[PDB]
Amino acid sequence: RPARPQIDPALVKSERPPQTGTVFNIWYNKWSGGDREDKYLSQTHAKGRCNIARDSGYTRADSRPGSYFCLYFARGICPKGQDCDYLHRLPTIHDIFNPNVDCFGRDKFADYRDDMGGVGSFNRQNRTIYVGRIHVTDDIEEIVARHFAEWGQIERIRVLNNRGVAFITYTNEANAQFAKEAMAHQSLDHNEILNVRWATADPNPLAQKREQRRIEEQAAEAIRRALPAEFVAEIEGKDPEARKRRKLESSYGLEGYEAPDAVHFARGPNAVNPRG
Amino acid sequence: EKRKGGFVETQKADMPPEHLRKIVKDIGDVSQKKYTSDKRSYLGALKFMPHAVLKLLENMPMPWEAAREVKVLYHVNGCLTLVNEIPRVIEPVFFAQWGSMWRTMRKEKSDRRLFKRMRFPPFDDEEPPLSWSENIEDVEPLEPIQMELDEDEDAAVYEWF
Amino acid sequence: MPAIRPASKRKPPPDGFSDIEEDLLIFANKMKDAQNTPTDNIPKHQAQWPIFQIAHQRSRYVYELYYQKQAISKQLYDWLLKNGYADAMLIAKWKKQGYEKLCCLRCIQTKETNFNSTCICRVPRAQLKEDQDIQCVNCGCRGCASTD
Amino acid sequence: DFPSVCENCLPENPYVKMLKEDYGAECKLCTRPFTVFSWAGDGRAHGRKKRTNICLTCARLKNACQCCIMDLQFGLPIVIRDKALELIAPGPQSEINREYFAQNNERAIEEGRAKTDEKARELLRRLANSKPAALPPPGPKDWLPPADKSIMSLFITGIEDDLPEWKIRDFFKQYGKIKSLVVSHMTHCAFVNYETREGAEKAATELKGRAVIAGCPLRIRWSIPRPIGTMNKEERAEMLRDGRSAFP
Amino acid sequence: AVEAVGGGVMRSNREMKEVNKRLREMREDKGSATIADGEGAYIGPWARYKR
Amino acid sequence: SAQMGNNTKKQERIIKIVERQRDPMEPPKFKHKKIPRGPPSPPPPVMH
Amino acid sequence: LAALQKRRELKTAGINIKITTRKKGQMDYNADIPFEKKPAPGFYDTTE
Amino acid sequence: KEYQGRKRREFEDYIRRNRLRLQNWFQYAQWELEQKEFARARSIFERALDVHPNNTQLWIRYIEAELKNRNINHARNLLDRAVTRLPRVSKLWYKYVY
Ligand SMILES: [Zn+2]
Ligand SMILES: [Zn+2]
Ligand SMILES: [Zn+2]
Ligand SMILES: [Zn+2]
Ligand SMILES: [Zn+2]
């Protein structure tokens, strides 16, 4: 199906912010001569939301290989339809991105914003969004589960009721980025202005252990792709057949040699081992 | 011979005046957030604004011309319009033209009853600048200062003076 | 001159101008409407595209009125090219072979591209991907090659 | 004078058209200006050109690709590589500390002063392959559907920390149509709100309070949808032993 | 040679001309360029490839 | 050289590098910064 | 001392917030070892 | 951490005002040793050695900080470095043999 338009350009015309100052600064495009408190409290409601069934479809980015998702489609304010140059779709698990960019093509940073808002950081592979300003009721866990299950695929939902805060950990960083951009300033079953940011590192040592274990699991996956399966078996040594191949091949003739790991696993065309 | 640099080379052409007109009309006062990526260059072209002032003021029309068209070199931002001309004249012709201005102006100053000098500044401080397309583009110009030449006596310069 | 004269100073156009004045004014009013078009809902190079489109169309009207379906005198054609109703350099390229349908001179200007190339709109669409919709940044041309 | 860009960031065409701009951008790592190399991609995507994002000094000090900022030896993010094989190197990221560090390393490297991690990932794979009254079984009241058709929620018992909602939702989705699925690993609890009463009844009749999901035994019954509060440690402990004792 | 589609390919100038013909009637109508306004007006290189 | 994770050989590469056409009206892009000067080169033995 | 007292009372009564006095033009000496100069390696191992 | 950041700021303000004052460097490094930040105290000692490369009192302070906190290998590396740097200062040779 073609990508449908979500709203119309008659209300996607470009115009100034409402006047909160004496004079409009044309360099920074901001109002001046006013106050600072107004800006702090003012956080309005979102002007739209998107639907996988109704809105998500095909476009010139589905034609063009290796392009990005539409941030305005994620926000539900994309009037472009089929003529948008960015994908109108939720990322699957096969949608991966490099650390320098996010799923919307916006550059990622070495740091975080001091309010943990924005694009994110390549110095931390964060898949956990932080949803605050939730109306505290008893069905909040059901509502959070329903809406964020609609927004992607979840590894861990942790909703606190005291302060009304849902920490959602997706299994894809692109899913986390899409969920943050699609749930910021939107509302659950009650009319509320959700504060969807990047979550901080979890001080729970169980979560620290599982995050570290996932880091070594991903890294060891990369190592095992890099190395041949037979060096993998010999180095792992969980089974006695590869263990005895390890002793024999490291012996290279002589009894009781036990070749250095560097010599035995030095990969190359013609180094020592025929496994190379 | 046509690709003696790897590519087919052509002369730089002139664009339509409506292209430059559309560029300056769109950017306007540089107030819409679309034009930030232009803002750094626009303000950067301030360094070259003195050339634009000299080129415009030296290619200004003479009192015997109602209007003059000039070649301009313009930035594609709409930041800098440079009159790319030199006001080259035949010195005897330019002498005769300004001498005829001297005589015509003296006759008009003897014949006018009251000379109302035009105001300075011609426009108000807070009055926004006028538009080529809505205020000047197709407007009928008044008569320039021109001597009534002689069909017989000034026959030799009559058609082209 | 193409500078505007008062009225008494104005020289009349050649013969046939009364015959073509209506189409010339149609192009002129089309150009003024392109000046007055809104730009909020489209990008910026896309805002400049219609001027190049209408300039091509006006010059093509003059060019094929003189060369293909001979309906104007050479005096009138030279007067139109001098007084700005048509682009003489675009018409010159249309006379050249392999440039019979060029959109604009900026699209063959090779000194002004990153790798001294022409634009992609000059490439025969037979050598491009299927359903690869090109609309060049310079004028929005979807294919100029003479084969196209 | 030539970028250190990997072959997947480079175009598929073996003949590359690069643009070079001195002082083109700030390095994302050290925030210093560096020469940018940029190339048009493969598919004429709108986007931009793919460019170098960090300087050559930061690429050499972090052994990274200069576009993707991934490790040149395994294809990992630099933080993942150095966290898992942390014995390579740290790095500073406070403001003038990071420019100071980059300027001192660059001056040292350029004036002369100043393959290494085989042992590190051999050790990593060694470490990762170093592995880490009685409650009654459910009865006929537990696997029989109650007459109250307003009760739609199923209740799952004994959830380990490593049990994820995507496979839980896939399993209950290939059974029936799910309205919502709440899983709390903190209290080892889950609620399932289905969409079809018939589908929920047939799935719970299929499972009978017993489920084998990824080697984790789970007890599913019927219960009223309840907010999972801050349960007692003894409450979640007995919850875990109930999930374990679902299978005798 | 790498970048154009149809790399290599034993293909002659005449069948260049028919391939361009089929593409040129896949493209829409350019117009007449002696009719300034209305239907039939010139659109030329800005003609849409019908898809 | 090889790849991040692949040791299969792949094709030799011809790179065409051109300096980018920058807009002549642009000021410089980046504000300069004050960084303390780095430490000296390792001081030599004092040969008294 | 007064701000410390107020922050301790807030942390005791639940809400925890980061009072950050970090000005404009000041380094974060807590965040990172400033201008870090590591000891030169020598003939003796210092890993333990 | 609040108190430590305040103290670190005042120490480095005095190092920026007068880097040539050994007591500024000495009190900063001794305070970090008291906070058990041995990497931080080492870094302060090494930056002090960048400003005062040939200072016997400074070399002795650094060596003694390592020896007092039982970093024997760090201290012997410092002793080799110091008698390389200052081979006609018999104090450093006597400290090393002792
Ligand atoms: Zn063109
Ligand atoms: Zn073009
Ligand atoms: Zn074209
Ligand atoms: Zn850098
Ligand atoms: Zn790369």
What is the DSSP track for H15-68? HHH-TT-HHHHHHHHHHHHHTT-HHHHHHHHHHHHHHSTT-HHHHHHHHHHHHH
The Cα B73–Cα B86 span in angstroms is 13
Bridge partner list, D181: D192
The Cα C141–Cα C122 span in angstroms is 9
Tell me how close the Cα of E12 comes to any Cα of chain C, in angstroms.
13
The Cα G24–Cα D213 span in angstroms is 54
**Measured at the alpha carbon of residue B56, what is the angle toward residues B54 and B62, in degrees to the nearest 5?**
115
Tell me how close the Cα of A11 comes to any Cα of chain C, in angstroms.
10
In sign, the C-alpha dihedral spanning D131, D134, D137, D138 is negative
* Dist. CA D72 → ligand 5 center (Å): 8
Q: Which two tokens stand for residue D148?
A: 């109250």
Asked if residue C143 lies in contact with residue E27, where contact means CB atoms within 8 angstroms, the answer is: yes
The Cα D219–Cα D212 span in angstroms is 9
Q: Exposure string (b/e) for C56-86, b if CB count within 10 Å is 16 or more?
A: bbbbbbbbbbbeeeeebeeebbebbbeeebb
The Cα D12–Cα F13 span in angstroms is 10
Parallel, antiparallel or unpaired: strands D15-26 and F14-19: parallel
Q: Is H63 left (phi over 0), alpha (psi -120 to 50) or beta?
A: alpha
Other CB atoms within 10 A of residue E36 CB:
19
Half-sphere exposure in the Cβ direction for D107 (13 Å, CA): 11
Tell me how close the Cα of B128 comes to any Cα of chain C, in angstroms.
19
Which residue's entry shows tokens 């349960």? D231
The Cα B78–Cα B24 span in angstroms is 5
The Cα E29–Cα E49 span in angstroms is 10
Other CB atoms within 10 A of residue B68 CB:
14
Q: Cis before residue B63, ω within 30 degrees of 0?
A: no
Which residue's entry shows tokens 């035949």? B90
Q: Which two tokens stand for residue E36?
A: 């300034």
Q: Which two tokens stand for residue B21?
A: 């007109």
* Dist. CA C140 → ligand 1 center (Å): 7
Which residue's entry shows tokens 């490099």? A98
Parallel, antiparallel or unpaired: strands D15-26 and A195-198: unpaired
The end-to-end CA distance of chain H, in Å, is: 39
Distance, CA of C22 to chain centre: 18
Task: Dump the DSSP string for F3-39.
Answer: -SS--S-----EEEEEE----TTPPPSS-----PPPP
The Cα D55–Cα D30 span in angstroms is 8
* Dist. CA G2 → ligand 4 center (Å): 43
Task: Dump the DSSP string for A120-177.
Answer: -BTTS---EEEEE-----SSHHHHHHHHHHHH--EEEEEEETTTTEEEEEESSHHHHH
Q: Exposure string (b/e) for C16-28, b if CB count within 10 Å is 16 or more?
A: bbeebeebbebbe
- Residues from chain H that touch G36, judged by Cβ atoms under 8 A, are 39, 43
Half-sphere exposure in the Cβ direction for B71 (13 Å, CA): 8
Asked if residue C101 lies in contact with residue E44, where contact means CB atoms within 8 angstroms, the answer is: yes
Provide the 3-class DSSP secondary structure of residue B147: coil
Asked if residue A96 lies in contact with residue A171, where contact means CB atoms within 8 angstroms, the answer is: no
Asked if residue C57 lies in contact with residue C26, where contact means CB atoms within 8 angstroms, the answer is: no
Return the DSSP state at B153.
Answer: T
The Cα B129–Cα B125 span in angstroms is 10
Tell me how close the Cα of F12 comes to any Cα of chain H, in angstroms.
47
| Number of cross-chain residue pairs from F and G with Cβ atoms under 8 Å apart | 3
**Chain B: residue whose CA lies nearest to C55:** B16
In sign, the C-alpha dihedral spanning H39, H44, H45, H50 is positive
* Dist. CA D5 → ligand 5 center (Å): 5
Q: Which two tokens stand for residue E4?
A: 């154009």
Technique behind the model: cryo-EM
Parallel, antiparallel or unpaired: strands A154-160 and A165-170: antiparallel
How large is the angle between the packed helices H38-51 and H22-34, nearest 10 degrees?
A: 170
Identify which ligand lies nearest to the alpha carbon of C52.
Answer: 1
Amino acid at A197: R
Which residues numbered 1-48 in G keep a CB inside 8 Å of some CB on H?
Answer: 4, 26-30, 33-46, 48
Identify which ligand lies nearest to the alpha carbon of C99.
Answer: 3
F6, F7, F9: best to mutate for the A interface, most A CBs within 10 A: F7
Residues 6+ apart with CB under 8 A from E21: none
Q: What chains are in contact with C, requiring at least 3 Cβ pairs below 8 Å? A: A, B, D, E, F
Task: Dump the DSSP string for D11-52.
Answer: -SSSEEEEEEEEEEEE-TTT--EEEEEEE--SS--SS--EE-
Binding residues of D: 6, 9, 27, 30, 55, 58, 65, 68
- Residues from chain C that touch A15, judged by Cβ atoms under 8 A, are 40
Provide the 3-class DSSP secondary structure of residue C105: helix
**Chain F: residue whose CA lies nearest to B75:** F25
Element (H, E) at C52: helix C44-66
Other CB atoms within 10 A of residue H76 CB:
18
A89 closest CA partner among A116, A59, A122, A112: A59
Q: Which two tokens stand for residue C102?
A: 């060029």
Asked if residue F8 lies in contact with residue A225, where contact means CB atoms within 8 angstroms, the answer is: no
Amino acid at D38: S
Own/partner contacts of B36-43, CB < 8 Å, gap of 24 or more, are: B36/A29, B38/B77, B38/B78, B38/B79, B39/A27, B40/F26, B40/F27, B41/B75, B41/B77, B41/B79, B41/F23, B41/F25, B41/F26, B42/B77, B42/B78, B42/B79, B42/F25, B43/F27
Which residue's entry shows tokens 């003195």? B50
- Over its C-alpha atoms, chain H yields an Rg (Å, rounded) of 14
